[PDB]
Amino acid sequence: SRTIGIIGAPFSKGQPRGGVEEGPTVLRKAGLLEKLKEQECDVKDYGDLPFADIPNDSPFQIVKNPRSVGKASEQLAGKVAEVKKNGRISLVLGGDHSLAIGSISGHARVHPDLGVIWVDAHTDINTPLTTTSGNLHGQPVSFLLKELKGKIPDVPGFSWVTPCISAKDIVYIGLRDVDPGEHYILKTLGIKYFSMTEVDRLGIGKVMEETLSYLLGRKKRPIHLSFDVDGLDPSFTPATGTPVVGGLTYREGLYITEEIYKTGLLSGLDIMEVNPSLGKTPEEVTRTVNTAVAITLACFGLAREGNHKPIDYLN
Amino acid sequence: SRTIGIIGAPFSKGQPRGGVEEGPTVLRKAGLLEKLKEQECDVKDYGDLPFADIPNDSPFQIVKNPRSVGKASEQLAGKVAEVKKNGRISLVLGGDHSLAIGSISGHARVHPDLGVIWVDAHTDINTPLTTTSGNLHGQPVSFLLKELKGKIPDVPGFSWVTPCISAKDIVYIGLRDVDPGEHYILKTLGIKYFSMTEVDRLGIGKVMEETLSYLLGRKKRPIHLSFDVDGLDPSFTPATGTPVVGGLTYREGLYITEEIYKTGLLSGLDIMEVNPSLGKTPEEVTRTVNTAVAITLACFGLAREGNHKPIDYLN
Amino acid sequence: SRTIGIIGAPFSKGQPRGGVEEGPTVLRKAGLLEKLKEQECDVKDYGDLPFADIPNDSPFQIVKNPRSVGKASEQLAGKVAEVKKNGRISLVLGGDHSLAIGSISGHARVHPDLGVIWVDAHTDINTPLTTTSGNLHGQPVSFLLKELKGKIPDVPGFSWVTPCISAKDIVYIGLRDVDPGEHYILKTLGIKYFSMTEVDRLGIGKVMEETLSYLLGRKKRPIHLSFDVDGLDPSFTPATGTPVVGGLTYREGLYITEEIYKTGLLSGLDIMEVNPSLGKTPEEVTRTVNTAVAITLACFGLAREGNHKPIDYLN
Ligand SMILES: NCCC[C@H](N)C(=O)O
Ligand SMILES: NCCC[C@H](N)C(=O)O
Ligand SMILES: NCCC[C@H](N)C(=O)O
Ligand SMILES: [Mn+2]
Ligand SMILES: [Mn+2]
Ligand SMILES: [Mn+2]
Numbered sequence A, B, C: 001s002r003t004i005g006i007i008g009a010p011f012s013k014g015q016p017r018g019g020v021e022e023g024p025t026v027l028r029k030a031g032l033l034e035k036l037k038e039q040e041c042d043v044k045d046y047g048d049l050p051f052a053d054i055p056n057d058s059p060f061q062i063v064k065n066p067r068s069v070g071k072a073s074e075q076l077a078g079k080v081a082e083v084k085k086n087g088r089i090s091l092v093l094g095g096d097h098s099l100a101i102g103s104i105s106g107h108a109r110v111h112p113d114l115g116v117i118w119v120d121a122h123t124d125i126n127t128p129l130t131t132t133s134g135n136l137h138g139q140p141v142s143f144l145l146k147e148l149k150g151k152i153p154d155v156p157g158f159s160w161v162t163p164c165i166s167a168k169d170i171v172y173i174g175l176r177d178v179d180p181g182e183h184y185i186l187k188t189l190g191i192k193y194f195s196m197t198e199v200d201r202l203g204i205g206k207v208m209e210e211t212l213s214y215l216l217g218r219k220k221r222p223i224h225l226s227f228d229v230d231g232l233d234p235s236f237t238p239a240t241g242t243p244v245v246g247g248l249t250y251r252e253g254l255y256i257t258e259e260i261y262k263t264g265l266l267s268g269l270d271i272m273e274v275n276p277s278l279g280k281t282p283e284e285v286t287r288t289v290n291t292a293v294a295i296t297l298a299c300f301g302l303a304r305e306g307n308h309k310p311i312d313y314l315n
């Protein structure tokens, strides 16, 4: 039985564009809870986290909205740990990706042996010192890696953070826009990744076999899937802040999640970067939201080959 | 030499939406016969079957237009058997997919050892008792399977039907929207299928190798290809009644058919669900029809690598 | 260090449609040189070749603009040989594909052991006698093959030509519209090709492994990549004269070039058939040009997994 703990995280200060804080609203409105219940799901809604306003939040060097970002993640981390303690798969509806700091942090408090699969067009592994944009949704992973401890300065709002994952406990899928400093970190820490080049070369089937084998080979452990919707091609998820052409297909998106579901190890899930305000047309918004919902439903059992209850349908 | 027997089947009562009965007209108008003759083809047109009107046709339980559907298939079955007896590959231009009952039935009368490849987003294997829509284009296969005998009630208009295929003589390709009862039947009868998940995992190349090996491994026998245009993604065939996103690509569509042609065993072909009335724009109609024609031409020899006559072109 | 020699070739008389002679202008305007320099590139611009007008140029049989086409290639051949002699990878911005005669001819003068990879929806291997269109952009390869010597009549403007490649030194990728005579030549000379059917069957990964192994297996030698933008699907490069559906994806396009770059053997490059005048909308033009630029940048090092300088980014 797949029990879920819904957590709305209407937050946008990890990046410039507003509208992404509406992600939880549009997804819910799309009937996400209803459709989840329509499946074999036990759904508990923990509501939308109220991210109080932090008016005084000047940049730290070039890092923008550090206290707002830091606080939102700290709050989310607490909520996620609570859902896990209740024996439910945490489902965080974003919101920009900076929230991954809180989501993965809170998840690790309850399940320290977790492994992370990061589906994204970006690595979001810039440090406060390697970033050129200063946008925190491009730095979450750097705050989480134990190996990057010593390279992360004391940024206001993140004193509560304690790196909880090692370079070896995370796999990237979908990369196609990686910054120079980010690439350096990838190669230096020996991080496992399947950029779009590897997906083209091997096919999504082998990519997933290798990804799960890499993380679950030595032993089984909880899986945390942080899914940035811009990991998929803009033809499928156009309403997002940092779209990059040549992305994962709708089919590959569903394949990744169907395979993750089949492990029975999904422990935490993030659906990030859905920004309804960035849809060039009303249809682009629904296309984006519909795809995000589809990806979510696949994570919890919906299979393209079909699904049926433990009953005799012919009798 | 590939000799063809064209059979127009302007029928739509297996489903709600009208316009699909125009399929034969638009395909022909697209120059299908001319282009077929432009190849190495011997083409004989048997015309469009005149499906007399059956005004009195109330539902059987929830099954709609049973007598109309039953009669159209009975007529088509007779026509197809006639074309086969003339030593020609029957080419049925639909028309909704309920016609598969007649097409495969008539084909089996002449070639009982036939194997079926079903390209579709759906399994169309609901029984009159498992269907929720009552639309007969979602039940053709149930009427044809010998194993499902005993589960098919006496529906008005189908007393002439005699299941002619076993669960082991059919392979599905493209599935992505299968009903619960349908999935139950798939798993219970051990039916071979390659849903979109398997195509993503293995690639269309291995899918076809396995499909042909599965049906022709023990021995060679006539192949019946029932191609529902909604098997391909709506980006290629939008003018259809039951479109589902994440479908087979134009390329995969041509690959399936090129490979089937190469066997030299194509015996019967169905081109179904083309509905010109459902095109949101004039271009969507031509896009759909053009793709349907392309698929058809590939079934009869047109290869993307090129084609040339048994002559010395350089001399 | 990858040093490049830019050569603008604003020529269109190898085909009917004007506008393709604007290819060098739109690509440059797109910041191609700037972006190349933004990489690890040493860029030298040799300018746009001034293709003087040849008013008196009646057809040779049905072959159109023979003297204009012949002269433009003769000029380009000289320029390319000059760039190679300067130790730089020649980068020819077309212009229609008839220019390949000059580009590959001039390249071979300096590097006779070169191997050619031809990415295109067409084989462009018609002879002046097998062509039905008379358009010379559909015949460049026939003029270059040593084996086709004796089948090429004395066409005005090409007396300077001397076939420089053998059937075994070229590989085609992307074929989907090959003429009958062309197919005959393919099979008769035993030319290695991966039509769209082979790409579907094997996947672009194996296609490239086989392509490079085929050309570099016996020994390493300079590679000449003649890239016709219509090799990619029209959804990515619509502004081109002879588009054909079911082409290579944006991803496959980048994969081919990333793999070629990694060999360290790219010696000559052609970016052909970009026609800004054929864009049905301003967006179709930018989409086409943007993709052409992306393909070019990949040939010279830009990797989707990321790039970084030989420095310590964390310090
Ligand atoms: N989440 C997008 C991050 C984009 C860019 N690498 C940055 O650091 O801003
Ligand atoms: N041919 C489409 C059938 C769709 C649905 N499974 C049904 O039974 O109506
Ligand atoms: N470059 C396109 C060539 C198209 C056709 N095969 C021809 O010979 O004109
Ligand atoms: Mn991203
Ligand atoms: Mn992200
Ligand atoms: Mn269907």
Ligand SMILES: [Mn+2]
Binding pocket: B097, B120, B122, B124, B137, B228
């Ligand atoms: Mn169907």
Ligand SMILES: [Mn+2]
Binding pocket: C120, C121, C122, C228, C230, C231, C242
């Ligand atoms: Mn071409």
Ligand SMILES: [Mn+2]
Binding pocket: C097, C120, C122, C124, C137, C228
């Ligand atoms: Mn060409």
